């Protein structure tokens, strides 16, 4: 190829994409450890009959963690994901429930391809190289220019 269009492209699509999976399993975390002076007050409560987990300081309120998320995800696609893992507030700070996740898709050998091309929206497919040694893996990812920077338009879009 030697032609370029739109203004979102394959390398900037990979990016995005490997910054919104460090995004996401940072929050699932329970911390965001590019913060390093962070106040974890390490308590935990019950609800919905799971065991819930408070939220270090600068993911201390549902304000401060879309805030985090907002460079990287669209509005919509932060109070969705926060609804869908059933992210809530108890005592005025934020808490998410205990569990553990993890995938053999290795991001930073995958490849993009685009799919689609629309004015303020764009898609790319991912081809995903597992560490199984398994053949790759496909997955489709859209951005989406919230004002004037390109977001993803879903929370687990990548991981």
Not at 94 to 113: F, H, M, Q, R
């Amino acid at each position: 190829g030697k032609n370029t269009s739109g203004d979102l492209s394959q390398k900037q699509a990979l990016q995005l994409a490997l910054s919104a999976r460090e995004h996401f399993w940072n929050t699932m975390s329970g911390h965001n450890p590019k913060v390093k002076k962070a106040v974890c007050p390490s308590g935990t409560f019950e609800y919905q009959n799971l065991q819930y987990v408070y939220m270090c300081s600068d993911l201390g309120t549902k304000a401060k963690a879309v805030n985090y998320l907002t460079p990287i995800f669209t509005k919509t696609a932060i109070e969705k994901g926060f609804k869908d893992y059933h992210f809530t507030v108890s005592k005025g700070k934020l808490a998410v429930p205990i569990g553990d996740g993890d995938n053999l898709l290795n991001w930073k050998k995958s490849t993009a391809k685009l799919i689609s091309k629309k004015g303020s929206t764009i898609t790319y497919e991912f081809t995903v190289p597992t560490l199984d040694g398994s053949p790759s893996a496909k997955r489709k990812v859209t951005f989406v220019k919230e004002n004037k920077k390109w977001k993803v338009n879903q929370f687990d879009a990548v991981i």
